[PDB]
Amino acid sequence: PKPTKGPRLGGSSSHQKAILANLATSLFEHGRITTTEPKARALRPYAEKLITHAKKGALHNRREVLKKLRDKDVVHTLFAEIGPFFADRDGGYTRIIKIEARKGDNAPMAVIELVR
Amino acid sequence: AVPKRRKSRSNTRSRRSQWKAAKTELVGVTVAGHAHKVPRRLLKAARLGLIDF
Amino acid sequence: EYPSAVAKARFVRVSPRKARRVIDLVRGRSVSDALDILRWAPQAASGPVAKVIASAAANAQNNGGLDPATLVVATVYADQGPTAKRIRPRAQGRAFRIRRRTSHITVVVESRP
Amino acid sequence: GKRTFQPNNRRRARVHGFRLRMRTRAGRSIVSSRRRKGRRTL
RNA sequence: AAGUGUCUAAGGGCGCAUGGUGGAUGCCUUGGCAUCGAGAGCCGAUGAAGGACGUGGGAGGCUGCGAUAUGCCUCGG
RNA sequence: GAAAAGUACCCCGGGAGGGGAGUGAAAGAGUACCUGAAACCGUGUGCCUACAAUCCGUCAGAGCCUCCUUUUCCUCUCCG
RNA sequence: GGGAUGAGCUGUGGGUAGGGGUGAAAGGCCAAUCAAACUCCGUGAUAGCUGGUUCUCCCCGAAAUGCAUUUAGGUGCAGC
RNA sequence: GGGUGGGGGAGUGAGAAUGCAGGCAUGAGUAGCGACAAGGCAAGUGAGAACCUUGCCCGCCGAAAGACCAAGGGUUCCUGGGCCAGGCCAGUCCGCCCAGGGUGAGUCGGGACCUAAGGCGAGGCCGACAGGCGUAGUCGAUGGACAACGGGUUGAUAUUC
RNA sequence: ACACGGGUUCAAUAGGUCAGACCUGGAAGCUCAGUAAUGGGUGUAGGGAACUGGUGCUAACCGGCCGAAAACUU
Incomplete structure (x- = not known):
């Protein structure tokens, strides 16, 4: 991921790191994850890089994914099922879809999905 | 500063x-049911299903 | 000339300028075309406006004996309602007013093919 | 430091309480006044 | 070729028609103010005036009343 | 409102709110209620307005729409 | 930033009251306006000062000078 | 309920007083939405969910942003419903509205004990009256004796059951 | 904000993926030395953001709109 211009997500860059790692944790948990569209725009490259490591599959890839997602077990699933599931796709692991804007802020919502 | 004068109802x-x-709006979109006119923005989650209504 | 149904929401707690910015989006448009427009309008006064456009089309069907697929919104008003002045206390003991403006949406639908 | 008006039942009563208003003549006068006006007196 | 010729309405103004807001005007009144007339002209240690607390089948307020507590007894109508 | 006869019943609505029904002499009296001013806020409609300053009017004034109409007129005037 | 075992801070309860209190004094504080608090009363104080004074028309129609004045932005008399 | 004719009587006429009260405009859908602690993700309920509930992350305080008492408040406590008002938005929730329930002491803290400063003050001296000051005395804790601890419990009470 | 420019499956427009330019500076693991701190090997490692060029995997989605017809003269 190149950085983002403009104000980083959540609060500052640290909260953006935490947001991204949380969104990727729950993405590699459920596969289908709804956020607001700018969160998904920030997370799509980030998650696709993590899954690149997943389909690499070695202790260095595990140790460089655990440097983002603290959780040992969602990453067990990453380097167990989600990883090999992309035995073919070179790039293009996630997919954004448009949901209707959240009432209360009209925040453009989007559901990001592991391709399958 | 304050409005020096009130505004002529024209302005x-x-x-x-x-x-x-x-x-x-993107009329004539076949989904489950009778064709709903979802906006051109959302019609992918209209097709797939990830849209309320 | 026409068999034109009617409806009116009274004391919808939506301010009439915020309500008319949405009203101006069904000015003379097919009744279900207008409902399908106010479902996606974010303008968040679409709640009352769409509710009473659907109410007026329903009144057409059930009390004027007409068919939905012909109606077209003929008039939409957003008359004033009461205003319920709240008090908001501000900096340095000065106490300012906050109008709770509410509106009256008013729909009249027709039948003209 | 930053202080305005400190509530107390003891000082409120021991000064602006009935049993002290009737402890004098200007206070009996004041209770009389408020009973004329028709208040719920003190 | 040269010349002429409005149409437009994002929106404004004006006038009419149709509404809404608000609560003026009219017309009142379970309310006052001002007098006139006839009284009465003090109450309280036999506990006053004024109240708190309660009292009703059920919430409170006003009113009545006071642990006998919207009441008790006699005389009358 | 004289009287509560305060809108039973269906219809849209999650409710408020309305539509039709019905009460009432009147709903152009709906528990936001006698009559309902003006400011104010809209909807529509005739005119005008996107080369143009002008206490925002006044006078002169073409045109455009208006209802009203005399007739060339149609002699279907035995009906406009 | 100054003080921080002290002429320290703070709690509770209490006392001192308006020409008075208290004041390591500034005319500072005395319940968010203290060279005399606040409230009710005299009271509708009072001002030679400022503002305001509401419907129509018909006729007439000035003055801004003189003199005096604790008076000179008021007024009395005259003049108009 | 008013005409009009002759009369009587006026709180008789407003466009101004930085006039008074009500309503309603312009600014203007503009500022702001109350700290530089940080949120989300899945699920639920629901008409409707960024804010409500369950979870799991993640983050902030931790000489306080935790736990208690004193005053102060005065039911804000808990259960049930509600979402026509408020909550600087929305809310299905709420310290909101409505009903109903809830506060158990010989030992805790006060009065049934004591008193300091100080208040009142029989008689009393002084004052013109008003009043002032006060003796004996009686109040007055912020202080001095004084007898309960460990645990369990509920929706809400605990050295109280 | 709008605008402006590029692109929309005949696509290299963003993203991803690959090979680069660069930035850092010598990964992890395993191994060997060392009492150990730590140091050598695997090995310009490894990590990586914008820059370049590939590559049809993801998103550009079987679209909605608004748009002419002139009254005529020397």
């Missing part, structure tokens, strides 16, 4: 009228 109304609202 008042003339830019209460520049307080518009946007639009787009």
Whole structure:
């Protein structure tokens, strides 16, 4: 991921790191994850890089994914099922879809999905 | 600073009228049921299903 | 000339300028075309406006004996309602007013093919 | 430091309480006044 | 070729028609103010005036009343 | 409102709110209620307005729409 | 930033009251306006000062000078 | 309920007083939405969910942003419903509205004990009256004796059951 | 904000993926030395953001709109 211009997500860059790692944790948990569209725009490259490591599959890839997602077990699933599931796709692991804007802020919502 | 004078209802109304609202709809979209006119933005989650209504 | 149904929401707690910015989006448009427009309008006064456009089309069907697929919104008003002045206390003991403006949406639908 | 008006039942009563208003003549006068006006007196 | 010729309405103004807001005007009144007339002209240690607390089948307020507590007894109508 | 006869019943609505029904002499009296001013806020409609300053009117004034109409007129005037 | 075992801070309860209190004094504080608090009363104080004074028309129609004045932005008399 | 004719009587006429009250405009859908602690993700309920509930992350305080008492408040406590008002938005929730329930002491803290400063003050001296000051005395804790601890419990009470 | 420019499956427009330019500076693991701190090997490692060029995997989605016809003269 190149950085983002403009104000980083959540609060500052640290909260953006935490947001991204949380969104990727729950993405590699459920596969289908709804956020607001700018969160998904920030997370799509980030998650696709993590899954690149997943389909690499070695202790260095595990140790460089655990440097983002603290959780040992969602990453067990990453380097167990989600990883090999992309035995073919070179790039293009996630997919954004448009949901209707959240009432209360009209925040453009989007559901990001592991391709399958 | 304050309004030095009140606004002639001409100007008042003339830019209460520049307080518009946007639009787009993509009519005739077959989904489960009778064709709903979801907007061109969302029609992928209209097709797939990830849209309320 | 026409068999034109009617409806009116009274004391919808939506301010009439915020309500008319949405009203201006069904000005003379097919009744279900207008409902399908106010479902996606974010303008968040679409709640009352769409509710009473659907109410007026229903009144057409059930009390004027007409068919939905012909109606077209003929008039939409957003008459004033009461205003319920709240008090908001501000900096340095000065106490300012906050109008709770509410509107009356008013729909009249027709039948003209 | 930053202080305005400190509530107390003891000082409120021991000064602006009935049993002290009737402890004098200007206070009996004041209770009389408020009973004339028709208040719920003190 | 040269010349003429309005149409437009994002929106404004004006006038009419149709509404809404608000609550003026009219017309009142379970309310006052001002007098006139006839009284009465003090109450309280036999506990006053004024109240708190309660009292009703059920919430409170006003009113009545006071642990006998919207009441008790006699005389009358 | 004289009287509560305060809108039973269906219809849209999650409710408020309305539509039709019905009460009432009147709903152009709906528990936001006698009559309902003006400011104010809209909807529509005739005119005008995007080369143009002008206490925002006044006078002169073409045109455009208006209802009203005399007739060339149609002699279907035995009906406009 | 100054003080921080002290002429320290703070709690509770209490006392001192308006020409008075208290004041390591500034005319500072005395319940968010203290060279005399606040409230009710005299009271509708009072001002030679400022503002305001509401419907129509018909006729007439000035003055801004003189003199005096604790008077000179008021007034009395005259003049008009 | 008013005409009009002759009369009587006026709180008789407003466009101004930085006039008074009500309503309603312009600014203007503009500022702001109350700290530089940080949120989300899945699920639920629901008409409707960024804010409500369950979870799991993640983050902030931790000489306080935790736990208690004193005053102060005065039911804000808990259960049930509600979402026509408020909550600087929305809310299905709420310290909101409505009903109903809830506060158990010989030992805790006060009065049934004591008193300091100080208040009142029989008689009393002084004052013109008003009143002032006060003796004996009686109040007055912020202080001095004084007898309960460990645990369990509920929707809400605990050295109280 | 709008605008402006590029692109929309005949696509290299963003993203991803690959090979680069660069930035850092010598990964992890395993191994060997060392009492150990730590140091050598695997090995310009490894990590990586914008820059370049590939590559049809993801998103550009079987679209909605608004748009002409002139009254005529020397």
